């Protein structure tokens, strides 16, 4: 099973809300090239390559780990989508 899957299931009132949050966070990470991560450099997921350890390119795993840390605020009608995208671009240009 996915690491910390029980906590992720228990943190939301519906598993599909969990899936939506994870997918949206993964796409947000992909769009900005993982520069908007809330993970410390010691917490970033790593993959083992012949050259050496590298950052995990799977955005879903990154989103799941970030949501496990608990530093992500998720819900309905938080901020306007256009304003949120503009602010995220301003903080992390891509």
């Amino acid at each position: 099973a996915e690491p910390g899957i029980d906590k992720l299931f228990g943190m939301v009132d519906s598993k599909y809300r969990l899936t939506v949050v994870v997918a949206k966070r993964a796409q947000q990470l992909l769009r900005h090239g993982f520069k908007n991560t809330v993970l410390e450099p010691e917490e970033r997921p790593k993959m083992q390559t012949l050259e050496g350890l590298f950052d995990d390119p799977n955005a879903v795993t990154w989103a799941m780990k970030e949501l496990l840390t608990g530093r992500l605020v998720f819900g309905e009608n938080l901020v306007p989508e256009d304003r949120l995208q503009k602010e995220m671009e301003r903080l992390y240009p891509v």
């Binding site: 299931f9 009132d13 519906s14 598993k15 599909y16 809300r17």
Partner: protein
């Protein structure tokens, strides 16, 4: 070889019927989804814990498997006080709660359990979270937005192949789901009253007598 070929032909002509019944069940309940947490309905169903056995002509405790299939993962509509334990209204019945209810019935303290069921659900184009109960795949209350209609249809239609075909078995299930009139249909009393048998060699007649009817 006669019996072996009969069984093979039965399976061959039964798989198609089971698949077609599954398709019907999917296509009739494709719109049923958990659409709200609670619809606020006050109706319920009283799931019976005792079956009226006719050979003894008395109420006998049903099997544990039947009670579990009829009560596990269901919301109590009314508060139930059994064996010093108070299960409040809106409490999901887990396996421990089902076993407690079974023990209470064995102690002769409760005859039927009032639970919320989809039959009494007032949600339009679907059901509610508090009426469905647990998501049996996770042993926790059903998540809002699950396609419980498709799950129900698949669950009913999956063991159709395992049912024996040889008014019994899969054809019985098919005629039950289609609400068909059985060929050897039983005779029921239209109104309540006292029964009177007038068995005669010429004709057999049964009379239901009331105050004026």
């Amino acid at each position: 070889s006669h019996g072996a070929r009969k069984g093979g032909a039965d399976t061959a002509l039964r798989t198609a019927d089971s698949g077609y019944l599954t398709r019907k069940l999917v296509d009739v309940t494709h719109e049923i989804v958990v659409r709200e947490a609670d619809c606020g309905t006050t109706n319920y169903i009283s799931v019976p814990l005792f079956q009226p056995d006719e050979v003894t002509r008395s109420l006998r405790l049903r099997k544990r498997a039947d009670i579990e299939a009829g009560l596990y993962g269901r919301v109590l509509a009314r508060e139930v006080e059994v064996l010093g334990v108070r299960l409040e209204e809106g409490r999901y019945l887990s396996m421990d709660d089902v076993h407690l209810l079974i023990k209470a019935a064995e102690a002769g303290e409760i005859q039927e359990v009032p639970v919320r069921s989809p039959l009494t659900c007032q949600t339009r184009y679907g059901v509610c979270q508090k009426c469905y109960g647990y998501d049996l795949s996770m042993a926790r209350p059903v998540s809002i937005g699950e396609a419980v209609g498709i799950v129900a249809a698949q669950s009913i239609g999956e063991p159709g192949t395992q049912l024996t075909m040889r008014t019994q078995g899969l054809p019985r299930v098919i005629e039950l789901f289609e609400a068909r009139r059985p060929k050897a249909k039983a005779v029921i009393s239209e109104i309540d009253g006292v029964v009177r048998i007038e068995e005669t060699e010429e004709k057999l007649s049964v009379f239901v007598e009331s105050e004026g009817f």
